[PDB]
Design a protein around this ligand. Structure first.
Ligand SMILES: CCCCC/C=C\C\C=C/C=C/C=C/C[C@@H](O)CCCC(=O)O
Ligand SMILES: N[C@@H](CCC(=O)N[C@@H](CS)C(=O)NCC(=O)O)C(=O)O
Length: 154
């Protein structure tokens, strides 16, 4: 697979310049807000390791993922994930904006077995108590993300 799924937004011209994977894929990231949200809301902690490995506490069990760059779409990563219940899936993401030490705004998209993509904008924070940073105000306006839903972290 050399490009993101048809229907997924490549966000051309809307992604930060100079993204540094070495600084982003380190430590823990809490998923604190999102454009679209489920009920009940939860607090997912994404743990990162070397070579684009990650672990998080998903809807029904731990999820382990392995990432790789997407050759045809600058900034995008493909993650192959497995769940403790025995399931597997693929998901795509790009970092739209981040300061690495506090927050990160991501886009995520996948087909998940369908022909219709399901996507989202995600706000990650280094602290579970993190909320919406002042530095993203204009970017959120531009992307029409004026009302991010707060999830289950505090
Ligand atoms: C610290 C970087 C974390 C970003 C990793 C991105 C993708 C791989 C990890 C998890 C993917 C989970 C996808 C589940 C989606 C589905 O339940 C909700 C669809 C809308 C959405 O993307 O939120
Ligand atoms: N809807 C399809 C696909 C479901 C699917 O792939 N779900 C993935 C992505 S939402 C999953 O299990 N994620 C676990 C998690 O996000 O914690 C099915 O029921 O087989």
């Amino acid at each position: 697979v050399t490009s993101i799924p048809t229907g997924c937004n490549a966000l051309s011209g809307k992604i930060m310049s100079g993204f540094d994977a070495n600084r982003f894929f380190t430590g823990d990231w809490y998923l604190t807000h999102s454009r679209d949200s489920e009920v009940p809301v939860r607090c997912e902690k994404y743990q990162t390791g070397s070579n684009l490995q990650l672990n998080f506490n998903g809807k029904n069990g731990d999820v382990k993922c392995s990432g790789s760059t997407v050759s045809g779409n600058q900034g995008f990563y493909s993650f192959q994930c497995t769940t403790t219940s025995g399931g597997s899936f693929t998901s795509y993401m790009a970092v739209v904006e981040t300061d690495y030490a506090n927050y990160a705004l991501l886009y995520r998209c996948g087909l998940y077995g369908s022909t219709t993509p399901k996507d989202n904008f995600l706000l990650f924070n280094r602290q579970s108590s993190g909320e919406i940073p002042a530095g993203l105000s204009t970017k959120l306006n531009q992307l029409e993300l004026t009302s991010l839903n707060k999830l289950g972290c505090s």
